[PDB]
Amino acid sequence: ADCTEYCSNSCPFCNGQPLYQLCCINNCCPS
Fold first, then answer.
1. Longest C-alpha distance within the chain, in Å?
2. What are phi and psi of 14, to 5 degrees?
3. 14: exposed, middle or buried (Cβ count in 10 Å: 0-12, 13-18, 19+)
4. Residue 20 main-chain phi, psi, to 5 deg
5. Residue (of 1, 2, 12, 10) closest to 29 by Cα position
6. DSSP tag of 13
7. Domain coordinates of the chain in residue numbers?
8. By three-state DSSP, how is residue 31 classified?
């Protein structure tokens, strides 16, 4: 949770959205 394992960057605001692919994978850690 909070992108603690999904990506190095922590995103506590990510759990405020239902989508994690466009939130954590894309927005939090663009690639």
1. 22
2. -70, -30
3. buried
4. -110, -25
5. 10
6. T
7. 1-31
8. coil
